[PDB]
Symmetry: C2
Amino acid sequence: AKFKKDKEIIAEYDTQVKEIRAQLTEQMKCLDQQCELRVQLLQDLQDFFRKKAEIEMDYSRNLEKLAERFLAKTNVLSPVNCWNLLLNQVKRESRDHTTLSDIYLNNIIPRFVQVSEDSGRLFKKSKEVGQQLQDDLMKVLNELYSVMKTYHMYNADSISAQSKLKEAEKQEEKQIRSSVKKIEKMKEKRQAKYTENKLKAIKARNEYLLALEATNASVFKYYIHDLSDLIDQCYDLGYHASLNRALRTFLSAELNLEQSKHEGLDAIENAVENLDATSDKQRLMEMYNNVFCPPMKFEFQPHMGDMASQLCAQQPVQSELVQRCQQLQSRLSTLKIENEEVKKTMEATLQTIQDIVTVEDFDVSDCFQYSSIAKRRANQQETEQFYFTKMKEYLEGRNLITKLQAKHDLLQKTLGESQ
Amino acid sequence: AKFKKDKEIIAEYDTQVKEIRAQLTEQMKCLDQQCELRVQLLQDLQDFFRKKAEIEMDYSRNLEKLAERFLAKTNVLSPVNCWNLLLNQVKRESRDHTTLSDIYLNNIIPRFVQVSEDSGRLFKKSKEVGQQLQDDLMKVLNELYSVMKTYHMYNADSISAQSKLKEAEKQEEKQIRSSVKKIEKMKEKRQAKYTENKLKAIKARNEYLLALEATNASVFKYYIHDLSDLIDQCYDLGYHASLNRALRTFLSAELNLEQSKHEGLDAIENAVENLDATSDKQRLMEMYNNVFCPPMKFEFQPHMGDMASQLCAQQPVQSELVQRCQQLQSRLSTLKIENEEVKKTMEATLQTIQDIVTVEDFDVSDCFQYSSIAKRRANQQETEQFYFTKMKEYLEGRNLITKLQAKHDLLQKTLGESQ
């Protein structure tokens, strides 16, 4: 092994001490940097929510004017009910986004402001704890220099007192009364001084070993426990907890707006399911009762006191009435066969139209995954054209059948099948 | 009963005919009015969605610039992960509202445009059917006038031929050969004429009864069936069905935007639940390994070839080392009792701080139902103040205990409890 003196031992120690001081400074720089990052995030969070509140108010105002626009230019009928509920949903959504903006401004932003301010306080105090820790550790490292130096001085004195003693022992067996006595008292004085010096050296070595033990314990405690604890117990005090609550306030606000919106959309879905042409027609006909009310039946009006009120089927008129009845009947048979054919065409075409207009083409889910028209329209048009043609035809046929049947039935009543 | 002539019967009939014509016109006015209402609703629906698309694009653009603002001013740590996901949610919501605007412009509005155009066609045709119906009905009512008039004329001829016959019968029993023959041929000519005229009258009455029957059947069919059918089969063709699909496209778009938003908010909720101070600390210490890495232990450095490396507890130094050991031990006992008391105060105060910062104050549900701060803050501050005081105290106590213990333990090793 090396034979080392004070200058070298001290310098080699000083090297590691300066390394530790350098590492302590860096630890402080890392901590400062992490604090500046937290302060910056909290500032970003404030600016993010301030701007979003503004965006939300704008949206809200625009939705309000959208609803007002149509609520100013003004019911029982199912499509108007859908419309009413559609406008109500806009009013509801407008209010909800104002509420959102208020929550951002009055609840969420102040939490970030408060946490920023608290973090300012907290980090100043945590850094003070940190500096106390580093100051005590440096104090301990700096105490070791003199402890070692004392051990080095006293050890050297012990070595050189041993030199002067051992030569005075070699000079003892040289002269071995006048001179023999004189070098005896000499080697005696050396023996005393060595003994004293060996003792001083032992005690200083013991001091050094004791101090070393305290030094390693201090270094270990700082690096293995105190740094970690400083972060957990000081720097991180309240941070994650506060951020959790602030962000859960955001989530609560959103969840509630979504629940309110869902409610609104469900009311529109109910209205849409209540779309009902025949019920709307009932409502219309009842509203305008007097428009649709049937007139009193026309009655036979006796002229100049006429006693008779029924068909007269006596001779000679009976034969011609029988002729007529038969005439009406066969003609009605032709017309009815023809009319049924037109009816069946009209009904089949109506079905086709129903197929066209009830096509389930409303699912727009594909539009939310991010990772020819004129020919069907012309076909529907031509189908509807043919439909109205057959409808007009059907109705004219029916109108003639109604008149002829009515006359036939009155004759049948009077005449019977056998007369 | 009244004895009525042609003028009165015709006028009373004409009155009810003019009533029916008047009611037919009103039916047409009601139908026109209902069509203008449908056309107007569909126009409102177009204008509503055109404006909402605009509102939605605006909102979308604003959200995009909100995200870009922060995505430009730029990780592993749990709070930064929450922030990242928060900005991602804005990007997602921006896109979803553009999609919404596209669906309004490219899908929903064209449906209302198309339905308006189709309704224009449909109503023109339905009105034609209506006019055919009303024209035929009016035709039938107008046919009855001549039928009645003929019955009135022939009935009158029958009455007055009966007059001239009956007097010629009274003049028969007057003269009852020259004159007797002359009035016989007279009453004969009357008998022929009456018989002829009674027959004409019967036939005209029969015609009238037949025509009446056809007239009442036509009126009934129109009022009880045709009007209702005209509405169902013509006016209402495709309307409710088309509106259903258009409005369900709206609902689908909304449902999908809500599902996408829900997904986004769930990802933020996951991040918030992953807020973890100790894990973030592990990550930090590992990132900056060389900042936090402990130095090599200080070793005993032998001076000028020193052979000894351990405590020397021989006499005379043993007694003083024993004295010292005991000295360290009793002092360590005092310090530890004191240090534990400070530790317990510090820990109880930490608990209080944890209670403060983890308060569940984030539910904002009450804000969506539409039908003192500085004192708790000063308390938290003073609690934190006291906490740092006790922390500094605790750590200084601990730092002394660490050094004294380390020296005590080395002595205990060398000396034992009995020496």
